[PDB]
Each structure stands twice: as structure tokens, then as C-alpha cells.
Amino acid sequence: PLFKSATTTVMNGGAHKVRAGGPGLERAEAGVPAEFSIWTREAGAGGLAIAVEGPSKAEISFEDRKDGSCGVAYVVQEPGDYEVSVKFNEEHIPDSPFVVPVASPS
Numbered sequence: 517p518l519f520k521s522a523t524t525t526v527m528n529g530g531a532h533k534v535r536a537g538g539p540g541l542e543r544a545e546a547g548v549p550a551e552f553s554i555w556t557r558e559a560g561a562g563g564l565a566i567a568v569e570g571p572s573k574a575e576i577s578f579e580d581r582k583d584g585s586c587g588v589a590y591v592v593q594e595p596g597d598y599e600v601s602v603k604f605n606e607e608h609i610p611d612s613p614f615v616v617p618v619a620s621p622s
Contacts (some may be wrong), residue, residue: 531607
């Protein structure tokens with residue numbers, strides 16, 4: 517039940533200063549890597565933990581960025597609502613449990 521795919525990646529003012537957004541957190545396509553970005557400007561780095569909870573398996577891929585920005589892309593194997601629970605340095609951030617409506621690309 518839930519926690520279909522999760523990832524804890526260390527990042528090399530607090531979690532309340534960290535908010536997540538991007539296409540990947542507003543909509544997702546079944547069988548497509550939905551990429552979202554986490555606002556880690558005023559944070560101080562630490563550890564980015566992400567758990568994708570949904571009806572089916574999700575493919576979480578983590579890619580780094582030269583500026584030191586965060587970019588996470590996850591697929592979904594089947595359409596539905598997906599609640600991505602994030603944690604920055606063990607903190608669930610303000611409003612992490614983002615439910616992303618995954619729909620069929622077709």
C-alpha cells in the first residue's frame with residue numbers, strides 16, 4: 517500500500533524555505549518521466565528524501581545540475597493520483613504531500 521517508489525538523496529534557513537514545484541508536481545503522464553524541481557536556494561543543502569505514493573510503480577530518476585539545482589523525474593507506470601511526499605533534512609516541508617494527477621499521454 518503506497519510507497520511504490522522512494523528515494524533518499526543527499527544534497528552535495530530550513531525545510532520551510534524549501535518548496536517544490538514544476539511540471540512533474542502539477543501533472544504527470546503514465547509511462548513518462550515527470551520532472552519537477554525543488555527550490556533549494558535558501559536551504560543549506562542536506563538530504564532530499566522523496567517518496568512517490570500511488571496506485572502503481574513509479575520510476576524515480578535523480579539528476580544533478582551544474583548550478584546546484586535539484587531536478588527529479590519520475591515515471592508512472594499507470595495513470596492516477598500520486599502523492600509525492602518529500603523531506604528536506606528529515607522535514608516534510610510546508611505542503612510536501614503533492615498529489616500529481618497522472619494521466620495517459622494518449
